[PDB]
RNA sequence: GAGCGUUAAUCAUAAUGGUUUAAAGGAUCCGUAGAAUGAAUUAUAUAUUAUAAUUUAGAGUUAAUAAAAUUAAUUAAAGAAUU
RNA sequence: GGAUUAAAACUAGAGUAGCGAAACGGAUUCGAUACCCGUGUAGUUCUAGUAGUAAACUAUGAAUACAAUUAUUUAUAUAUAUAUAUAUAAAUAAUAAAUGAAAAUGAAAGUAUUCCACCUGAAGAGUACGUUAGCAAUAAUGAAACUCAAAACAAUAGACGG
RNA sequence: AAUAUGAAUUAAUGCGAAGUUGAAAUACAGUUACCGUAGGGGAACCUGCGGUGGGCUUAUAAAUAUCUUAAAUAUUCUUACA
């Protein structure tokens, strides 16, 4: 419709994709020594020594 | 004459009279302000305007509108 | 699966909104109201509608009768306040959207515009009469007030006799009709078109677009829209001659011009010692018959808002109205007869006046307490999508007929003029018709000019002084 | 020939269009008679005093 | 002559254009793609600022024919999104531009 | 669109509808069965003139 | 011939010129086509009237309208043939125009043939200013003539002092015939009273005619015998 | 019946060639729907019932009496010398039928040549029914259904 | 067509080169005994002494290969190798014996493209 | 490039085709199958299909009124001329 | 699948003026198994059959929906101040748009839908072989090898034309 | 009986060079060509019967013309008159 606002998010649930500034901010957590780095699910699989 | 109507004329056409078509006027009255604002505007801005008529007797009245 | 009281249509890059109750005379209830209201604000927000277009289903019998009072009138009866005060406020947000729109609106006042109607023209730049229009503001006779803003308009477009809004006084007052031409003559109509080419102008408004860089919203594409309307305009009647003759316009002039405190009994003073021509004399008591069978309250406080929102910006004004309108339905202090008049009016077909009970003479403070807003019931416009007020039209000048105050102030810079000239009726013409852009050959542009130095100017030698 | 060079160079043009002609063939068509020399003497009368007017408030804002 | 251009790169949508025995299929392409087309065509898109664009020509591959086919069908077979919003009276999103703005 | 596409005939319209087509077909057959007649009595005043002896 | 598209858009084609650097400098119309765009939609246009006598174009009269019996005697219950074929064409025919004054117009001229003979100008003055009461057949500005009786007669009816047509007709004629009588009589008059106060004529109608007709016999002589003299030598063969 | 669809696209596309503002289609529920979807995408400026001479003024009930008479009149649109309902042609076709998946019409929709359907163009609409209802492919996409997929609109 | 006659059969050609070496029975190249050596004649507009020569190949099929290079030592009763390749001035000429394989020797003073005519390298 | 060439082969390289005049409309029509195609409204279902009811725009039947004297088959006649 | 299907041809029985393959003669010609002339058999005709072929052509399968004009006839209907006028169809002619290699097509060779037939370089070849049908002549069906880089259509400018 | 092979024997056809006997076709090609069919002839071809145009739509005259204020008035006219 000609007054329908679209913006970044809806466009983003059109094409089937996390929000481009989503990306920018998951990509910035990536660093050794930057905010948010986390890796913890994969300590799910069971191992014999 | 209805005969040597042009189709492409239609949505000027009020009727047809006496076997030729007659000219919806209050669409010419708006067609020719409008035309006549574009001679003012041209003139006002010094273009150059050019009347053109090649029938018999239209000199003398494009001589005096030039 | 009723027929919608509103109709929306797209014309081209144009968006035509057409009023859909013709047994109703177009009447407004809250539910139009809000309707246009509401699209108004989204096409606002659209980049493919250039400008509106306002028109009636029912022309040429009406464009729109008036706003629906007598359903406010039972309100009142059953004490359903809230339903009036949400009437009004959708009537006067819509008002005061139309005034600060954005985008040019078209209205196309084929056939009565009385009331409500005037609310939807009078705030628009662009509003083309036909000789069908009707226009009036018969409120005096139901105890309303001059409303949709009609106290901030009337004194500021009308060209004749109002230098100190005496003529919309007389209007708002007298509830006098006008029709066609008399009407685009006066500053009621910007526009003189007749109904017969409506049609074709619509397509061609329609089919007209902001050129290059240009959005709709610019004073270049508003120049547009008034050369396209212009181009269907024709020359009026050979037979017709303005409604109203210089001495009655001596008349209005004279014995509507009050003071800042003025009152309706020192118009009824003039009107009953008024003294000149035997049609002025005769013509002044017309007057007083008629302002003598209006609301006595309805009167004063017609005054009092033309008195107040001559010299203030839209929105308080507009503001104003809806203050005055609650104050009104809920009747506090008794002093206003509004709903037991619309009952004897409207509800009930009564041609004889409502015999009126409140006859005395409101305080100023009884006044400015029906005109301000009471701080137990909180009420405010709605927010449209311009959110601005000013105290001129932005368009209204330059598209419609000159008022009598810019062709004196042509003729007395003219006159203080180091070229030393003289002022001649001719170059008075001459600079209205054939030198201002946006008014050249503007219908009935040298008659009313000629009606001005008629009765407002003084030939002595070959110059004009300034009466 | 005058019509298609004038679409050719760019040319807005003005003309009669009479029953039997084509109006898409220039930008400000006037439908009207062009057979009697009363009728083009009457619509180019009114075309040359429009221009007149531009002119005369051409040289006018030049004086003033 | 100017010729439309989406995002002054490729053509709006795709082209299906017969001129005389030539028939032209054009194909817009996502940036950074190229020109894979007839070569007369690659020439074309060159002058004009074309830079993605794919497409085949069936029957008539006469050199001369598909120029003049190309620059018609580049003309009179495209419509810019602006040009059908207004005839429309609608608003055409471009989605790939709204995912990356603010 | 909300507006149904088709309103079927009442019973009552049906009714009436059959009634004007049987009438139809009935007029014609009787107009048409006056007219033989008619020209049977037009050969009759003239069988005088007819030989069968 | 093809619609076209290049004489309406040389703004837009002008604009490219401008933007690219083509073309430096901007024509001096570039302005003035801009703020009045031309009308580019060239399309056909249906029509729902006959302006000239107000007939509806395009309604269809369904058979519930028709409940009572035909001239025939028949009942319509079902559509026929022609209410069955689409009618999109008479929407965009140019109506004929029809008058009811045309049909009195010729019969006015069969009953008065010589009527014809007085010249009648069809070059307009100006019709906007045809201030003409109906009243009475003589008018200040036009002839007495033919349409003097038609508007009289029109006058008649619209109000409504006769209903026939043919009797407001009759009316209206014998007011011609009076007023005609009038004239005959005055013309007369004043050639013999002129004679009789000395005024002199040099050629007369008839003295015109003569002189008129013995030119043309003067040449059919010289033919007449030159043709029966080449007419004796061929035969004599 | 896909038949008179499909005589209802070439006719929309005989008008547009000539420029007729006003023309008729027959009266059925499937052409109603057709002509109302255009309508609401902005491809006709108008959609009256009326019957074979022209479009109702004031509303005239359909019945077995007057149904062979009955037509659907639409307003075909134009802007800058350009018809604004250029093409018109049929995707399931009388003698080849297309049903799609909700997952293939996403593909139709994404740039993917689903069963020799060329994708949806800038600015076209395709247009699908399910269960007798005609409705816009990414309508259909947002309500999860399967349809055929009838005729794309440009 | 329509789509039912495509359904029984109606369609496109297929683009596929044929075999012009149909002797060979697909195979690279067979060997034969030369029948008789001889010299043919060019079709117009060519003039010239072509060396041919008659072949049994070792699956019965009789040919006719051209000798290419200047100068040869092929005689009837030789051991020669054919491969595809027609002589396209010589009608019916259709396959090529190969230099420097059975009896028949390289090119001989062979110094450019030696391996189209099994002429060795030089030290 | 430790490969290069050549021969033998496979895939790709135009039906996002055509049939007055270039390859290509069957002499013509009738009609069977068609796992060919094909009206309208409504209600169900397991749904572009099925079923049921209903409808008359395609396709037919019978009359009435008007019009026309051709095309088949058969029989009975006439005419100018020729030998 | 069925039926009908020009001319020639064939099987029987009639007919046979004129025309007329062939044949035999007369001319023409360097020659003249021809063109022209004569005598003129089959055939051309009728009845009962066989056969199913033609440039059997609009070299254009059938059906349906639809699109801008004019002219001219025809048909039906309507009206009247009675002989025209107004309508709606059909046919034909010239066209717009559209299509097309173009010539052009023009209500299709346009916009679409449905069904059938048919085509896939030239030549070999509508031939060979087989089969089916027929009294027969033949008709239908219908290849491959070898060879070649051709071959064809519309249009353009010339040259030439007894 | 089928399939394959060779085969006495026998039929059709292509290309290559290259003359010979005629001059059938393309122009009105010097007898319009071609289709079907029949007969005849060194060879092309000739002849009969019907069909087709992919040949004649290439289509282009038995000629004959008239009266109202010729001007002190129309012809001039520059936003004037009204
Ligand atoms: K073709
Ligand atoms: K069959
Ligand atoms: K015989
Ligand atoms: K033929
Ligand atoms: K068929
Ligand atoms: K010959
Ligand atoms: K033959
Ligand atoms: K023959
Ligand atoms: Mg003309
Ligand atoms: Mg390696
Ligand atoms: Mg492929
Ligand atoms: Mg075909
Ligand atoms: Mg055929
Ligand atoms: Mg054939
Ligand atoms: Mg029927
Ligand atoms: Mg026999
Ligand atoms: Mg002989
Ligand atoms: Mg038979
Ligand atoms: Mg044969
Ligand atoms: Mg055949
Ligand atoms: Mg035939
Ligand atoms: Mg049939
Ligand atoms: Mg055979
Ligand atoms: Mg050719
Ligand atoms: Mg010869
Ligand atoms: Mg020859
Ligand atoms: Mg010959
Ligand atoms: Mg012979
Ligand atoms: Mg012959
Ligand atoms: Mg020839
Ligand atoms: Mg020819």
């Not at chain 3, 005054?303 to 104050?327: F, G, M, P, W």
């Not at chain 3, 009420?379 to 999508?385: F, P």
């Not at chain 5, 495209?78 to 609608?90: F, H, I, N, P, Y």
């Not at chain 9, 060979?24 to 041919?52: E, F, H, I, T, Y």
């Amino acid at each position: 419709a000609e007054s329908e606002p679209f913006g970044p998010v809806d466009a983003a649930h059109v094409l089937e994709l996390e929000p481009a500034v989503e990306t920018l901010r998951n990509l910035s957590t990536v660093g050794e020594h930057s905010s948010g780095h986390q890796q913890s699910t994969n300590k799910n699989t069971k191992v014999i020594y | 004459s209805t005969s040597l109507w042009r189709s492409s004329t239609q949505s000027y056409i009020y009727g047809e009279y006496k076997g030729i078509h007659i000219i919806d006027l209050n669409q010419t009255l708006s067609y020719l302000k409008r035309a006549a604002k574009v001679v003012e505007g041209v003139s006002e801005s010094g273009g150059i305007i050019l009347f053109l008529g090649t029938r018999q007797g239209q000199k003398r009245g494009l001589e005096e509108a030039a | 699966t009723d027929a919608p009281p509103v109709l929306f249509t797209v014309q081209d890059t144009a968006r035509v909104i057409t009023l859909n109750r013709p047994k109703k005379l177009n009447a407004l209830n809250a539910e139009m109201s809000e309707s246009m209201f509401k699209t108004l604000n989204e096409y606002a927000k659209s980049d493919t509608t250039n400008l509106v277009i306002l028109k009636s289903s029912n022309r040429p019998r009406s464009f729109c009768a008036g706003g629906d009072v007598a359903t406010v009138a039972i309100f009142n009866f059953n004490k359903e306040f809230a339903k009036s005060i949400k009437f009004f406020t959708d009537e006067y947000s819509l008002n005061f959207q139309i005034a600060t729109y954005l985008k040019p609106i078209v209205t196309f006042m084929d056939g009565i515009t009385m009331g409500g109607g005037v609310g939807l023209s009078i705030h628009t730049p662009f509003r083309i009469a036909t000789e069908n229009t009707k226009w009036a503001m018969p409120e005096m006779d139901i105890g309303f007030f001059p409303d949709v803003g009609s106290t901030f308009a009337l004194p500021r477009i009308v060209t004749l006799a109002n230098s100190n809004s005496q003529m919309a006084l007389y209007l708002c007052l007298t509830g006098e009709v006008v029709t066609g031409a008399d009407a685009y003559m006066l500053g009621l109509a910007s526009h003189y078109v007749s109904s017969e080419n409506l049609d074709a102008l619509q397509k061609r408004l329609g089919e007209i677009s902001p050129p290059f860089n240009n959005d709709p919203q610019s004073a270049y594409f508003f120049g547009m829209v008034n050369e396209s309307i212009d181009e269907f305009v024709s020359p009026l009647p050979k037979d017709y001659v303005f409604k109203y003759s210089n001495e009655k316009l001596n008349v209005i002039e004279a014995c509507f011009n009050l003071s800042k405190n003025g009152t309706i009994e020192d118009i009824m003073n003039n009107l009953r010692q008024y003294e000149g021509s035997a049609e002025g004399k005769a013509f002044a008591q017309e007057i007083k018959t008629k302002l003598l069978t209006k609301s006595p309250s309805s009167l004063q406080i017609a005054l009092r808002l033309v008195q107040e929102n001559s010299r203030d910006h839209i929105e308080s004004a507009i503001k104003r109205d809806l203050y005055t309108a609650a104050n009104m339905c809920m009747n506090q202090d008794s002093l206003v007869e509004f709903s037991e008049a619309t009952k004897h009016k409207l509800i009930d077909k009564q041609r004889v006046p409502y015999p009126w009970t409140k006859k005395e003479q409101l305080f100023v403070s009884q006044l400015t307490s029906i005109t301000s807003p009471k701080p137990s019931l909180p009420m405010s416009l709605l927010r449209n999508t311009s959110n601005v007020t000013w105290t001129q039209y932005p368009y209204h000048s330059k598209y419609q007929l000159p008022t009598e105050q810019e062709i004196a102030a042509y003729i007395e810079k003219r006159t203080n003029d180091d070229t030393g000239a003289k002022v001649t009726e001719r170059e008075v013409l001459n600079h209205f018709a054939n030198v201002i852009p946006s008014r050249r050959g503007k219908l009935g542009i040298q008659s009313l000019c000629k009606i001005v130095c008629e009765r407002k100017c003084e030939e002595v030698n070959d110059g004009l002084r300034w009466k | 020939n005058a019509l298609l060079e004038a679409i050719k160079s760019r040319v807005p043009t003005i003309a009669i269009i009479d029953t039997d002609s084509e109006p898409s063939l220039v930008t400000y068509p006037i439908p009207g008679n062009d057979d009697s020399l009363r009728s083009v003497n009457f619509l180019l009368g009114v075309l040359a005093r429009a221009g007149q007017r531009g002119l005369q408030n051409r040289l006018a804002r030049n004086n003033e | 002559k100017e010729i439309p251009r989406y995002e002054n790169r490729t053509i709006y949508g795709d082209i299906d254009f017969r001129y005389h025995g030539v028939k032209l299929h054009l194909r817009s392409a996502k940036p950074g793609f190229g020109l894979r087309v007839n070569h007369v065509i690659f020439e074309i898109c060159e002058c004009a600022g074309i830079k993605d664009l794919s497409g085949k020509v069936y029957k008539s591959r006469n050199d001369m024919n598909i120029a003049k086919g190309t620059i018609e069908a580049f003309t009179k077979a495209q419509k810019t999104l602006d040009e059908v919003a207004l005839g429309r009276g609608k608003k055409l999103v471009d989605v790939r531009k709204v995912y990356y703005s603010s | 669109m909300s507006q149904p596409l088709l309103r079927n005939r009442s019973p009552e319209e049906s009714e009436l509808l059959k009634l004007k087509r049987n009438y139809n077909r009935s007029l014609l057959n009787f107009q048409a069965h006056k007219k033989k007649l008619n020209e049977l009595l037009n050969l009759y005043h003239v069988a005088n003139e007819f030989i069968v002896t | 011939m093809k619609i076209q598209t290049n004489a309406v858009n040389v703004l837009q084609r002008t604009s490219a010129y401008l933007k690219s650097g083509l073309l430096k400098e901007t024509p001096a119309w570039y302005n003035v086509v801009a703020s009045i765009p031309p009308s580019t939609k060239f399309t056909r246009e249906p029509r729902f009237k006959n302006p000239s006598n107000g007939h509806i174009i395009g309604k269809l009269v369904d058979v519930t309208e028709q409940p009572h019996a035909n001239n025939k005697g028949l009942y319509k219950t079902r559509p026929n043939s022609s209410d069955k074929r689409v009618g999109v064409k008479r929407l965009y025919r140019p109506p004929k125009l029809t008058y009811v004054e045309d049909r009195l117009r010729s019969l006015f001229y069969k009953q008065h043939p010589w009527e014809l003979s007085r010249p009648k100008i069809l070059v307009e003055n100006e019709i906007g200013d045809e201030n003409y009461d109906w009243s009475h057949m003589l008018q200040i500005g036009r002839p007495l003539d033919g349409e003097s009786v038609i508007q009289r007669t029109m006058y008649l009816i619209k109000t409504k002092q006769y209903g026939d047509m043919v009797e407001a007709y009759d009316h209206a004629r014998y007011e011609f015939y009076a007023l005609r009588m009038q004239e005959e009589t005055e013309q007369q008059v004043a050639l013999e009273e002129a004679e009789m106060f000395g005024s002199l004529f040099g050629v007369s109608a008839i003295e015109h005619g003569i002189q008129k007709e013995q030119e043309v016999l003067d040449v059919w002589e010289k033919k007449v015998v030159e043709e029966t003299e080449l007419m004796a030598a061929r035969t004599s063969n | 019946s896909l038949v008179k669809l499909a005589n209802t696209c070439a006719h929309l596309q005989n008008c547009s060639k000539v420029r007729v503002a006003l023309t008729s289609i027959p009266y059925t529920k499937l052409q109603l729907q057709f002509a109302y979807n255009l309508y609401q995408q902005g491809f006709l400026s108008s959609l009256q019932k009326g019957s074979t001479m022209g479009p109702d003024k004031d509303f005239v009930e359909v019945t077995p009496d007057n149904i062979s008479t009955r037509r659907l009149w639409v307003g075909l649109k134009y802007r800058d010398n350009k018809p604004v309902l250029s093409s018109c042609k049929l995707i399931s076709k009388p003698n080849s039928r297309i049903h799609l998946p909700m997952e293939d019409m996403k593909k139709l929709c994404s740039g993917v040549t689903i069963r020799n359907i060329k994708p949806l163009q800038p600015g076209e609409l395709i247009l699908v029914r399910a269960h007798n209802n005609i409705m816009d492919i990414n309508e259909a996409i947002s309500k999860k259904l399967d349809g055929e997929v009838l005729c794309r609109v440009k | 067509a329509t789509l039912n006659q495509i359904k029984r059969g109606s369609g496109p050609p297929r683009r596929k080169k044929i075999s012009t070496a149909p002797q060979l029975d697909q195979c690279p190249q067979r060997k034969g005994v030369v029948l008789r050596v001889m010299v043919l004649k060019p079709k117009k507009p060519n003039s010239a002494q072509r060396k041919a020569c008659r072949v049994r190949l070792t699956n019965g099929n009789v040919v006719s290969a051209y000798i290419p290079g200047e100068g040869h030592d092929a005689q009837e009763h030789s051991i020669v190798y054919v491969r595809g390749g027609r002589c396209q001035d010589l009608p019916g000429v259709k396959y090529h014996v190969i230099r420097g394989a059975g009896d028949l020797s390289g090119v001989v003073n062979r110094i450019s493209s030696r391996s189209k005519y099994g002429a060795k390298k030089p030290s």
